[PDB]
Amino acid sequence: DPNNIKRSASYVNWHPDGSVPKVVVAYSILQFQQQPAGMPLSSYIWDVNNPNTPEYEMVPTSQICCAKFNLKDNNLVGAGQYNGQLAYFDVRKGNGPVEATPIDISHRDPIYDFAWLQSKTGTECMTVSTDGNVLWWDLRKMNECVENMPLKEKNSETTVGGVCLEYDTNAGPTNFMVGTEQGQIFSCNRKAKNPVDRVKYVLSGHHGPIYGLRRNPFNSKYFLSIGDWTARVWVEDTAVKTPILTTKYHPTYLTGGT
């Protein structure tokens, strides 16, 4: 629409049921010294049956990014922001925060996430920032940090970023990777059978600020690394800390796919 002006779309997520062609979209501007003196942002939901003026508009209190949805339902939607302030919205009101996840002590940093855990018969979440402190929040009842562990690298430079984390396509007991932006993919499990230090993998070898991460589906577990302007394919073993099907060194610095 002609309000979708001066506002980069810095995500698009897709609605999860089958024959609902809706898209939830997510519009922002970073490098915030040119934070736009105009529009405070409000994302949207478009439909493909008609290119309708956005069915519902979600108005946040700050710059919406990364706005994932709620899993397999026609009700609810999450979001991210720039403070750290998560958000949460239902479909029968075109308004602001249904349950704004508040400020508490730790997470006061830009969030590129709103990632769901498979907490059955309920809802859940986690975040990631340019401080490190990946900080799980609550389920259904929302206001508390569940397993609020500021994570820490083994040799104590805990400002370890992330983007675009991926879970398990085999039933999902909390094994995941975090797309850490300094050129080193990290990984975790959260069930510390060991002490609380459980960040095994630094897969150093990708280049510069990483922008891609995805497991592969449809048969196996081989994950991807499309982040910098080389588009690899990586593998998860303790002996293969290096690609498998490296593909082309490109022009035009890469930024994202799956």
Partner: protein, 259 residues
């Protein structure tokens, strides 16, 4: 090196294809050179530099494990070399910029704390400045108390005309105003806490306004008298304003009870 089998039988097949590596490194060397000098936070620039630089460091290692190699040595020389010149002058210029913005501080804050974190991350991969960073982060606690204070200024009144006409909050406001132009900040935070208590007094005024907002005629008269008695008890020009609020209550009761 899934084979290497050096002979005098392979060799005269692979001079031309070690040459082909030399020309392919030159061709994507010009893709790097095109992308570099065409698209030539703040620290995205140093990441631009050292991304491409350790990127290009790996190929020189790969080749050098001699006729084309001289011209590849030419391009490699200055291109690798001046790009280090840019990273050097970049840290010079933004040492100047952090220094000057720090001086003005005694927006800019979010930029400079993000920048100090980011080349700090780089330089482990001034001291007074980082002390002050820790100070204004532990005072970011009370800078998130300033936002509570400014909210409180926002929602803080025709009902509140009585109390404000009788309140002496301007003395604490004048203490903040003399503060508006070390431990002074900390004691002013406790002054804010006392002022937040006065904000709780303002919202107690709001709550009493809202509860004054809302045969069987004896029951209705008893309910109205109970609401008025609750307002009057919860109260303690002031007598005149109390009478005015009671008259507005009576008018509202006549408006609602005539339906």
């Amino acid at each position: 090196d899934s084979f290497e089998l050096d002979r005098e039988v392979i060799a005269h097949d692979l001079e031309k294809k070690h040459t082909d590596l030399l020309h392919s490194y030159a061709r994507d060397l010009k893709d790097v050179a095109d992308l570099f000098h065409q698209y030539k936070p703040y620290s995205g620039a140093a990441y631009w530099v050292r991304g491409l630089m350790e990127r290009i460091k790996d190929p020189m290692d790969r080749l050098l494990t001699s006729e084309l190699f001289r011209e590849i040595q030419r391009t490699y020389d200055h291109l690798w070399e001046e790009m280090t010149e840019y990273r050097t002058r970049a840290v010079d210029a933004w040492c100047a910029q952090v220094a000057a913005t720090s001086d003005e501080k005694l927006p800019a804050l979010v930029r400079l704390l993000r920048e100090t974190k980011y080349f700090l991350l780089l330089e482990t991969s001034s001291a007074k400045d980082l002390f002050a960073s820790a100070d204004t982060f532990r005072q970011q606690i009370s800078a998130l108390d300033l936002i509570c204070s400014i909210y409180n200024k926002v929602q803080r009144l025709a009902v509140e005309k009585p109390l404000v006409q009788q309140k002496l909050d301007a003395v604490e406001q004048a203490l903040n105003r003399g503060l508006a132009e070390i431990d002074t900040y900390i004691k002013e935070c406790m002054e804010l806490v006392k002022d937040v208590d006065l904000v709780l007094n303002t919202i107690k005024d709001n709550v009493k306004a809202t509860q004054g907002i809302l045969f069987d005629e004896l029951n209705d008269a008893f309910n109205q008298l109970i609401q008025q008695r609750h307002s009057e008890i919860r109260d303690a020009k002031g007598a005149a304003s109390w009478r005015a609020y009671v008259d507005y209550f009576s008018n509202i009761v006549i408006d609602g009870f005539s339906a």
